[PDB]
Ligand binder design. Structure first.
Ligand SMILES: [Zn+2]
Ligand SMILES: [Zn+2]
Ligand SMILES: [Zn+2]
Length: 572
């Protein structure tokens, strides 16, 4: 009941009872909150409610202190002081942005803008409030009870009446009942259990609504610049492979934290693993939000670092299959690879946090709270995809608002920029360089002459809201017969339902733009599917076309992005 004010740190007995996170507010800030919002319940040792029997007055502006008790206007004794007066709320030890965070529903883009432009303590309040709001929203959907089991990978579902049905994609993970976590894909539906189980008829699945823990550590520690490399000991014998990053590795040791913007295929994992070879005695914890980002870092370390000093931390509540070649859960190995949600309480000489566009401020804070390091390196690309914000429906979230790190990279610029793309044919590099990198990305490869674009609106159908464009898939099928080398292409689209249809019609392996991030393929076939804000998002468009090493076929819906593609146009 006694704590510190989330706005000015002043000690107080007051917490806001109307705030979902119940933050400690001092007399000054508590007043400026209750007097400007619908929030009127104030909590101390005892709540600020009228003590008079059977009285329901709980509004602090309608209450007074009579002796050492609280009463409303109808029950106060002659000698009483208002609880709200002179810009203060009574209590021991005697804000426009805080009000908006405290009262918003997190459905507008402006809510996320504020959560990232506010002061550091308000970024944690915002991140805690958003996460709790997202989980209290997880109690709103309807239960799915299995009507029948068709096979080992297919079933029919019976949904709860009155409550909405949640989007059936890999994004939403249900906990089966505890028969393990399970996912779904589209009356026949495809079931994917984390644990193999004889799907009982009648057994139900419900979305995991986990408890949101409070945040203590800032999203970014206060920056410190040094005159010499601190706590790290460089090699003089550094492999020529990593020579291009020596000045940047030295910058890493001369700052508390550093940001690295690495466009697709510019050498982010190479830089991260080369940091270990540059400071050979340094203990490095490699972290990212997803198991896939952590696994890609593991694959790079397997090729350059001693396997006996590596360890992959895997949580006991295993959801997906991940990296198997390092010793598991050895927290004290020199190189620790672990997702943010599974990080142990440890220290390190360097912490490398990869795929930074996918981090939230909640993740940034958790990393600072579990890992106490000499240096923190943030690697990613603000021109790539952010974490899905399930509550956000109105407006688009710009890159400078993804998290604190992305805000810095878009405002003051990143500390380090990898400006040469080694993956993509020049047609793709020239396109994304002009689109999202202010013409600063350069192509290492020549033009492949295997990058094609076709403007074909087709016909848009919908599986609920997830879109399908069968004529765009038909155009691809026609192209494949005439271009058999493309038989080995990966089919990519902004929609899971478009991918499901293309998987059955084309037989190509399938990937959404969002699940393709961090991966690369020789050939990519991309169907835009629709002209929505989702399919036209320039970051999503950037990720989609930079998956290709050799060739890409883009079947476009949007004239704008089609005209921007520096590809050979095709006809049909
Ligand atoms: Zn205060
Ligand atoms: Zn409040
Ligand atoms: Zn009363």
């Amino acid at each position: 009941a006694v704590g510190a004010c989330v706005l000015c740190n002043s000690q107080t007995s007051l917490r806001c009872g109307a705030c979902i996170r119940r933050p400690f507010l001092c007399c000054k800030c508590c007043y400026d909150h209750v007097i400007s919002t619908s929030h009127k319940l104030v909590l101390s040792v005892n709540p600020y409610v009228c003590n008079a029997p059977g009285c329901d007055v709980t509004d602090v502006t309608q209450l007074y202190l009579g002796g050492m008790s609280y009463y409303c206007k109808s029950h106060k004794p002659p000698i009483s002081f208002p609880l709200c007066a002179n810009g203060q709320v009574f209590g021991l030890y005697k804000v426009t942005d805080f009000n908006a965070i405290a009262t918003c529903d997190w459905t507008n883009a402006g809510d996320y803008i504020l959560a990232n432009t506010c002061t550091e303590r308000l970024k944690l309040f915002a991140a805690e409030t958003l996460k709790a709001t997202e989980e209290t929203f997880k109690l709103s959907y309807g239960i799915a009870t299995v009507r029948e089991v068709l096979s080992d990978r297919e079933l029919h579902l019976s949904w709860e009446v009155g409550k909405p049905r949640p989007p059936l994609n890999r994004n939403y993970v249900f906990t089966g009942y505890q028969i393990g976590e399970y996912t779904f894909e589209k009356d026949a539906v495809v079931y994917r259990g984390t644990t193999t189980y004889k799907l009982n008829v009648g057994d139900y699945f419900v979305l995991t609504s986990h408890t949101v823990m409070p945040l203590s550590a800032p999203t970014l520690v206060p920056q410190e610049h040094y005159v010499r490399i601190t706590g790290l000991y460089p090699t003089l014998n550094i492999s020529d492979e990593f020579s291009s990053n020596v000045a940047n590795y030295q910058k890493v040791g001369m700052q508390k934290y550093s940001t690295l913007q690495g466009p697709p295929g510019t050498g982010k994992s190479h830089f991260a693993i080369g940091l270990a070879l540059y400071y050979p005695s340094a203990r490095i914890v490699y972290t990212a939000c997803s198991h896939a980002a952590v696994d890609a870092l593991c694959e790079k370390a397997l090729k350059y670092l001693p396997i006996d000093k590596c360890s992959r931390i895997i949580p006991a509540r295993a959801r997906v299959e991940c990296f198997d070649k390092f010793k598991v859960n050895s927290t004290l190995e020199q190189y620790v690879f672990c997702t943010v949600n599974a990080l142990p309480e440890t220290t390190a000489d360097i912490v490398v946090f990869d795929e930074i566009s996918m981090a939230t401020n909640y993740d940034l804070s958790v990393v600072n709270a579990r890992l106490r390091a000499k240096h923190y390196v943030y690697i990613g690309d603000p021109a790539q995809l952010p974490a899905p914000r399930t509550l956000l429906t109105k407006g688009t979230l710009e890159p400078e608002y993804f998290n604190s790190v992305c805000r810095l990279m878009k405002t003051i610029g990143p500390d380090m920029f990898l400006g040469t793309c080694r993956r993509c044919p020049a047609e793709i590099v020239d396109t994304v360089s002009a689109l999202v990198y202010d013409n600063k990305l350069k192509a290492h490869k020549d033009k492949s002459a295997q990058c094609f674009k076709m403007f074909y609106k087709g016909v848009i159908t919908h599986d609920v809201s997830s879109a399908i464009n069968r004529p765009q898939i038909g155009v691809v099928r026609e192209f494949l017969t005439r271009n058999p080398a493309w038989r080995k292409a990966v089919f990519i689209s902004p929609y899971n339902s478009q991918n499901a249809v293309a998987s059955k019609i084309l037989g190509l392996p399938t990937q959404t733009v969002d699940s393709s991030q961090g991966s690369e393929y020789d050939y990519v076939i991309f169907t835009q599917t629709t002209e929505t804000a989702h399919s036209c998002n320039v970051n999503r468009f950037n990720v989609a076309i930079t998956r290709a090493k050799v060739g890409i076929l883009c079947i476009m819906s949007d004239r704008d992005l089609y005209d921007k593609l520096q590809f050979t146009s095709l006809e049909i």
